[PDB]
Design a protein around this nucleic acid. Structure first.
Lengths: 250, 50, 50, 120
DNA sequence: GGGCAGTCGCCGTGTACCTCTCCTAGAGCAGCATGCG
RNA sequence: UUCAAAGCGGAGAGGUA
DNA sequence: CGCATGCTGCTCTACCTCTCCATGACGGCGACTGCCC
């Protein structure tokens, strides 16, 4: 909604399926926020690298996310002014899209947030007593599902950093980056976008969103109803000769 | 010609221990054949026994 | 038994020869790959006749 | 002439095994005309261990990947993909139209710069 | 452009208590029983 | 002066009201 | 009389990909998609 792009295009730019143009300067067939391809980028490179004429100010295309750059380029105040100026005139039947865009832009202006905070650069780790290690009867360990996901994230991050240190070929660095994206995505929410991550058996692992979201999640199981002390339970029989307001306790 | 009823006991079957054990044996045998094929080619000289 | 009912489909969808039949079958089963006659043959053999 | 270097993504813990099996496959298929060479890069660094032994650890620069020199052909591609314990070729990726999974990948040859850089 | 039928994917589907069973693959390394001349 | 050694998570199947 | 080889227990770490694991539920609601003007 913020970037004025369909979900498919943004999803293709992420996950390293296509490119995006960040500056189309000094060209005729290139537009801002236009999705390129591998062959298209190669054929444009065949002309930009010749450096014959009419191609100064090299255009930048980027096959990674580059969502940080697109979201940083936003200029909320004048975007809101332009959107209001356009929404003032003409309605047709499909100005609801501009209404949604204006609502989101106004929310971000009022809260004084930055849209580029939707792209993560650091992540937090939960304290270790909320993901404890328990010991079974035979001496075997039953570790949680969060520890596996954290281990996968840390291992992929360390491997990618090591590869970046040695100045490896870029076509492998991109594979590492895509795998790291998928790992962090599976930690945050498992099986939402791509494929579910299975553990020991073919059963899915429990992510951070599964803790809070279900009927057996925290909200409905631990906060709106609990177990208590000084309580008991037993079978009931009939007692005559009792008065109402009296009961018989063993 | 006539359409079919799926709740009819003429369109329903019973499986017992024999069939289920047969399926499990089949799966295990497929895995074993994969291991055998992987292992048989790792050696150039025969020096091998079944 | 009633060939004109299928003749309607033949006319509406266009007659296919073996080569293009396998071409289209491969295209619809496994999109994104270059069509091949041997590819379609192997796909059918693995799907139903194995 | 067209001897291009490609990188193949390999399963975890299968680097020497896949190289040995692939060399056996090419030598028995007599297809040296298309598949030329298979290699993995290493470096024997030196590290102090816990017991004080000055151990020469042979660390791979690119864990999980193997390098080949070959000529791109449909038969060659099909007979390298069919090797057990290999995932795919690293290269340009395409979206899967129906289903959820990795789709067709177009292999990308390595430019002379980095292959000259690594091999020294 | 306007307007769709048609289709694909995500959301949701009673409460309290009792009994039983089972719970990660692969590879690397070291010490004891067995058939033969 | 100190406490202190008994509590553990998940999955499946069945039952009572 | 003594010498050579398979079996068992412990330890140590690491993860990605498929032929996809199913194709008998039902309603509601929102977001693409091909087709006809």
């Amino acid at each position: 909604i913020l970037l004025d792009m369909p979900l498919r295009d943004v999803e293709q730019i992420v996950y390293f399926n296509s490119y995006v143009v960040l500056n189309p300067g000094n060209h005729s067939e290139l537009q801002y926020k236009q999705l390129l391809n591998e062959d298209q980028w190669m054929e444009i490179e065949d002309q930009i690298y010749a450096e014959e004429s009419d191609l100064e100010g090299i255009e930048v295309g980027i096959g990674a996310e580059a969502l940080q750059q697109l979201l940083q380029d936003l200029n909320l105040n004048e975007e809101s002014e332009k959107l209001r100026q356009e929404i003032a005139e003409s309605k047709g039947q499909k100005r609801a899209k501009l209404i949604k865009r204006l609502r989101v832009i106004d929310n971000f202006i009022g809260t004084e947030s930055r849209p580029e905070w939707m792209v993560l650069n650091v992540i937090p780790v939960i304290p270790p007593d909320l993901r404890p290690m328990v010991q079974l009867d035979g001496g075997r360990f039953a570790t949680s599902d969060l520890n596996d996901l954290y281990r996968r994230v840390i291992n992929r991050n360390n491997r990618l950093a090591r590869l970046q240190e040695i100045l490896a070929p870029e076509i492998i660095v991109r594979n590492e980056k895509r795998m790291l994206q998928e790992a962090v995505d599976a930690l945050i929410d498992n099986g939402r976008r791509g494929r579910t991550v299975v553990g020991a058996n073919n059963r899915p692992l429990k992510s951070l969103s599964d803790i809070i979201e279900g009927k057996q999640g925290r909200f409905r199981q631990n906060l709106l109803g609990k177990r208590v002390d000084y309580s008991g339970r037993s079978v009931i029989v009939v007692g005559p000769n009792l008065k109402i307001h009296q009961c018989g306790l063993p | 010609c006539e359409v079919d009823d799926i709740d009819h006991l003429g369109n329903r079957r019973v499986r017992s221990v024999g069939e289920l054990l047969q399926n499990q044996v089949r799966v295990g045998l497929n895995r074993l054949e994969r291991i055998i094929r992987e292992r048989m080619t790792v050696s150039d000289s025969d020096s091998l026994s079944p | 038994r009633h060939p004109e009912y299928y003749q309607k489909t033949i006319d509406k969808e266009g007659q296919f020869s073996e080569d293009e039949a396998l071409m289209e079958l491969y295209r619809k089963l496994r999109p994104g790959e270059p069509p091949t006659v041997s590819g379609g043959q192997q796909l059918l053999e693995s799907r139903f006749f194995d | 002439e067209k001897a291009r270097w490609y990188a193949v993504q390999v399963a975890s813990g299968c680097e020497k095994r896949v190289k040995a099996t692939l060399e056996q496959r090419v030598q028995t298929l007599d297809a040296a005309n298309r598949i030329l060479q298979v290699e993995i890069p290493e470096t024997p660094i030196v590290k102090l261990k816990k017991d004080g032994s000055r151990q020469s650890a042979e660390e791979k620069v690119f864990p999980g990947y193997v390098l080949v020199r070959m000529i791109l052909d449909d038969d060659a591609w099909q007979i390298v993909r069919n090797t057990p314990h290999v995932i795919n070729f690293v290269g340009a990726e395409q979206k899967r139209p129906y289903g959820r999974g990795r789709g067709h990948v177009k292999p990308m040859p390595l430019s002379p710069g980095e292959v000259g850089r690594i091999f020294k």
